[PDB]
Structure 1
Amino acid sequence: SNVVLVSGEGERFTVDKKIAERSLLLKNYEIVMPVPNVRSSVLQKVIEWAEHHRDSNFPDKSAPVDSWDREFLKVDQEMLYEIILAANYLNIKPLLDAGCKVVAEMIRGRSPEEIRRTFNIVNDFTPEEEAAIR
C-alpha cells in the first residue's frame, strides 16, 4: 500500500502509506499529495529520514540527536535550511527537532565573529553599538 508525493521540481516519489503518515499534513483527512516549494532533492532526504525511522517512537536539555540523524544532517546549510522548512511544512516534529538541534550545535561554544563566518552574516553594528559590551 503506497502513496505518491509530488515535489516542487516535478518529480514523483512513491512511498509506503504508513511511512508517509509520519507527516501529519499527509496523515490528516492511488492518492497523490503535492509538496509545493520543496526541492525534489529535499523531499527525497525527508522520505529517507522517514523510512529510516519507520519503527522509531519519540517523546512529546533534551534527547540528543541520534548518531544517524547527525550524519544525514551533515549537509550544506541551504539543504539544512530547506529540510527544517520541509519538516515544518510537513509537520514532522521529530525532524524539525533534530534539525534545530544541529543548527544549535553549530552555534554552541563559538564566538560572535566565529558565528558570522559560519553563516556569512553581515556585522551591522555601529562602532558604538559594538563597543556596548557587557
Structure 2
Amino acid sequence: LVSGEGERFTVDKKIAERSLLLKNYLNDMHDSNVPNVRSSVLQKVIEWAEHHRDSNFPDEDDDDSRKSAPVDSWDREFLKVDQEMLYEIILAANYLNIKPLLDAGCKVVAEMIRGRSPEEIRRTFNI
C-alpha cells in the first residue's frame, strides 16, 4: 500500500479508490478475498488524488473527450515542477491505471517539449 523505501500514507480512503488499480488491488471486494512507484512520486500522485477528491472525470468513456482539450491550470502548475520527474509520474499514473493523471501529465509534458523547440524558444523566451 506504500513504497518500501520509507514510503507511507493513508492506507485507504476515497482517494485511494481513485486509482483503478486499487479498485481491485486495494482489498476491493474484501468479502471475496505501490511496489514499483517511487516514494516521492507516490506522494505526488496521492496529492493529486486528494486535490481532485471533489471532482469527476469521464474516464475512458469520454470518446472525443479525454484529449484535445486544455488541461486544468492547477494541474498544469502542480505537474510543471520537474522535467525529469514528470516522465516517472506519468509512468506511475500508468501503473496505477489512473487515466486522468495520465492525460494531464501527457498534456503537460507535450506542451513542455513543444515549447522547447528553437522557434518557440525565440518566440516566447526573448521575443
Q: TM-score range by the shorter chain?
A: 0.7 to 0.9
* Larger mean Cα displacement after TM superposition, 101-110 or 51-60: 101-110
Asked if structure 2 preserves the Cα contact closer than 8 Å seen for 1:8 and 1:37, the reply is no
- Deviation, structure 1 residue 74: 1.2
- Deviation, structure 1 residue 81: 1.2
In structure 1, C-alpha distance between the alignment counterparts of 2:11 and 2:37, rounded to whole Å: 17
In structure 2, relative to structure 1, the CA distance for the partners of 1:66 and 1:12 (3 Å cut) is same
Unmatched 5+ stretches in structure 2: 61-67
Compute the TM-score of the two structures, normalised by the length of structure 2: 0.73
1:31-88 CA distance string (max 9 Å, x none): 9999112221110000000000002111249231111101111122221011101000
Identity over aligned pairs, percent = 96
Which structure has greater strand proportion?
1
Compute the TM-score of the two structures, normalised by the length of structure 1: 0.69
Asked if structure 2 preserves the Cα contact closer than 8 Å seen for 1:6 and 1:32, the reply is no
Aligned length: 116
* Larger mean Cα displacement after TM superposition, 42-51 or 17-26: 17-26
1:92-128 CA distance string (max 9 Å, x none): 100000000011101325537989999999xxxxxxx
1:51 partnered with 2:57: no
Which structure has greater helix proportion?
2
The structure whose Rg is larger is 1
In structure 2, relative to structure 1, the CA distance for the partners of 1:32 and 1:100 (3 Å cut) is farther
Of the two structures, which has the highest relative contact order with CA contacts closer than 8 Å and spacing of 6 or more?
2
Quote the RMSD (CA, aligned, Å): 5.3
Unmatched 5+ stretches in structure 1: 122-134
SS of aligned partner of 1:12:
coil
1:90 partnered with 2:86: no
